């Protein structure tokens, strides 16, 4: 009986195995745009993905992860609210059963159809496992998805999902360029938070982009054909794999823009 997004093992149950679920810097949160304060001391975000080396795509039973070679500074996030260099390790999405839900973060209570998370770890801690034990161990770049025009840079991901339908399935996924998933603007909100999945560790600097990307209905429909279950088990569609907004508590959300 391990954690998931069902009625019996979903977000409301996670605290029983992971008491930090009720902690002081949990994610996601609602971003109240009028309460977020412009911070002129925040630098522009530096996203350097030109030498990114994707390796594999994996259905892990909760989402699909596109994994990168993080043994050298190849794809890094710097600047913004961050001190030092954060290396890209993987990206994944959260999405809904319907277009009106799916994102984890919300904006004035608005839910987007999905949310892309690019996960980076602080290279002063040597490896990801050590980084997640630190309050500034990770930086996650969050990008909202709305349904409209297709995202050309997403299609290579969409096309391979048939080969990783069920939990535990992986496929080679080389030469994917994550720059094709970014919006025009890198204006962002930032706050200190946590992993949004167990173990819910409070190790993340969240950087959530203001501008959503647009994906087609057909693209998100293919996300919804994935399975939570393993091969040869009863089919449970991988949908609504998002944690709802958590209490902001003693935190301020800062904006990079006016
Ligand atoms: N929505 S979220 O907070 O970004 N979810 C994070 C998903 N997991 C990962 N993302 O990028 N690498 C991940 C990954 N290992 O590298 N899983 C993972 C998750 C928690 C842990 F404590 C350890 Br150790 C590993
Ligand atoms: Zn995530």
Curated annotation (Swiss-Prot):
<dbReference type="GO" id="GO:0032849">
    <property type="term" value="P:positive regulation of cellular pH reduction"/>
</dbReference>
<keyword id="KW-0225">Disease variant</keyword>
<protein>
    <recommendedName>
        <fullName>Carbonic anhydrase 2</fullName>
        <ecNumber>4.2.1.1</ecNumber>
        <ecNumber>4.2.1.69</ecNumber>
    </recommendedName>
</protein>
<comment type="subunit">
    <text>Interacts with SLC4A4. Interaction with SLC4A7 regulates SLC4A7 transporter activity. Interacts with SLC26A6 isoform 4 (via C-terminus cytoplasmic domain).</text>
</comment>
<feature type="domain" description="Alpha-carbonic anhydrase">
    <location>
        <begin position="1"/>
        <end position="257"/>
    </location>
</feature>
<keyword id="KW-0479">Metal-binding</keyword>
<dbReference type="GO" id="GO:0005829">
    <property type="term" value="C:cytosol"/>
</dbReference>
<dbReference type="GO" id="GO:0032230">
    <property type="term" value="P:positive regulation of synaptic transmission, GABAergic"/>
</dbReference>
<dbReference type="GO" id="GO:0070062">
    <property type="term" value="C:extracellular exosome"/>
</dbReference>
<dbReference type="GO" id="GO:0018820">
    <property type="term" value="F:cyanamide hydratase activity"/>
</dbReference>
<feature type="site" description="Fine-tunes the proton-transfer properties of H-64; involved in the binding of some activators, including histamine and L-histidine">
    <location>
        <position position="60"/>
    </location>
</feature>
<feature type="binding site">
    <location>
        <begin position="196"/>
        <end position="197"/>
    </location>
    <ligand>
        <name>substrate</name>
    </ligand>
</feature>
<dbReference type="GO" id="GO:0038166">
    <property type="term" value="P:angiotensin-activated signaling pathway"/>
</dbReference>
<dbReference type="GO" id="GO:0051453">
    <property type="term" value="P:regulation of intracellular pH"/>
</dbReference>
<feature type="binding site">
    <location>
        <position position="117"/>
    </location>
    <ligand>
        <name>Zn(2+)</name>
    </ligand>
</feature>
<keyword id="KW-1003">Cell membrane</keyword>
<dbReference type="GO" id="GO:0070050">
    <property type="term" value="P:neuron cellular homeostasis"/>
</dbReference>
<keyword id="KW-0987">Osteopetrosis</keyword>
<dbReference type="GO" id="GO:0008270">
    <property type="term" value="F:zinc ion binding"/>
</dbReference>
<dbReference type="GO" id="GO:0044070">
    <property type="term" value="P:regulation of monoatomic anion transport"/>
</dbReference>
<feature type="modified residue" description="Phosphoserine">
    <location>
        <position position="163"/>
    </location>
</feature>
<keyword id="KW-0456">Lyase</keyword>
<keyword id="KW-0963">Cytoplasm</keyword>
<keyword id="KW-0862">Zinc</keyword>
<dbReference type="GO" id="GO:0015670">
    <property type="term" value="P:carbon dioxide transport"/>
</dbReference>
<feature type="active site" description="Proton donor/acceptor">
    <location>
        <position position="62"/>
    </location>
</feature>
<dbReference type="GO" id="GO:0046903">
    <property type="term" value="P:secretion"/>
</dbReference>
<dbReference type="GO" id="GO:0043209">
    <property type="term" value="C:myelin sheath"/>
</dbReference>
<keyword id="KW-0472">Membrane</keyword>
<dbReference type="InterPro" id="IPR018338">
    <property type="entry name" value="Carbonic_anhydrase_a-class_CS"/>
</dbReference>
<keyword id="KW-0007">Acetylation</keyword>
<comment type="function">
    <text>Catalyzes the reversible hydration of carbon dioxide. Can also hydrate cyanamide to urea. Stimulates the chloride-bicarbonate exchange activity of SLC26A6. Essential for bone resorption and osteoclast differentiation. Involved in the regulation of fluid secretion into the anterior chamber of the eye. Contributes to intracellular pH regulation in the duodenal upper villous epithelium during proton-coupled peptide absorption.</text>
</comment>
<feature type="binding site">
    <location>
        <position position="94"/>
    </location>
    <ligand>
        <name>Zn(2+)</name>
    </ligand>
</feature>
<feature type="modified residue" description="Phosphoserine">
    <location>
        <position position="170"/>
    </location>
</feature>
<feature type="site" description="Involved in the binding of some activators, including histamine and L-histidine">
    <location>
        <position position="90"/>
    </location>
</feature>
<dbReference type="GO" id="GO:0045177">
    <property type="term" value="C:apical part of cell"/>
</dbReference>
<dbReference type="GO" id="GO:0002009">
    <property type="term" value="P:morphogenesis of an epithelium"/>
</dbReference>
<dbReference type="GO" id="GO:0004089">
    <property type="term" value="F:carbonate dehydratase activity"/>
</dbReference>
<keyword id="KW-0597">Phosphoprotein</keyword>
<dbReference type="GO" id="GO:2001150">
    <property type="term" value="P:positive regulation of dipeptide transmembrane transport"/>
</dbReference>
<comment type="similarity">
    <text>Belongs to the alpha-carbonic anhydrase family.</text>
</comment>
<feature type="binding site">
    <location>
        <position position="92"/>
    </location>
    <ligand>
        <name>Zn(2+)</name>
    </ligand>
</feature>
């Amino acid at each position: 009986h391990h954690w998931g997004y069902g009625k019996h093992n979903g977000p409301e149950h996670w605290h029983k195995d992971f008491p930090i679920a009720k902690g002081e810097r949990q994610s996601p949160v609602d971003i109240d745009t009028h309460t977020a304060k412009y911070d002129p001391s925040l630098k522009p975000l530096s996203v350097s993905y030109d030498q990114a080396t994707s390796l594999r795509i994996l259905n892990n039973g909760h989402a699909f992860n596109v994994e990168f070679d993080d043994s050298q500074d190849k794809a890094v996030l710097k600047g913004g609210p961050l001190d030092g260099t954060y290396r890209l390790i993987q990206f994944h999405f959260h999405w809904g059963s319907l277009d009106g839900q799916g994102s984890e973060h919300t904006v004035d209570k608005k839910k987007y159809a999905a949310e892309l998370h690019l996960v980076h770890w602080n290279t002063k801690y040597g490896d990801f496992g050590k980084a997640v034990q630190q309050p500034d161990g990770l930086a996650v770049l969050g990008i909202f998805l709305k349904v409209g025009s297709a995202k050309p840079g997403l299609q290579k991901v969409v096309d391979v999902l048939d080969s990783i339908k069920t939990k535990g399935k992986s496929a080679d996924f080389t030469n994917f360029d994550p720059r094709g998933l970014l919006p025009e603007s890198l204006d962002y909100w930032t706050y200190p938070g946590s992993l949004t999945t167990p173990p819910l560790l409070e190790c993340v600097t969240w950087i959530v982009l203001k501008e959503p990307i647009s994906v087609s209905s057909e693209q998100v429909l293919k996300f919804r054909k994935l399975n939570f279950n393993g091969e040869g088990e009863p089919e449970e569609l991988m949908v609504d794999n998002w944690r709802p907004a958590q209490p902001l508590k003693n935190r301020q959300i800062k904006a990079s823009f006016k």
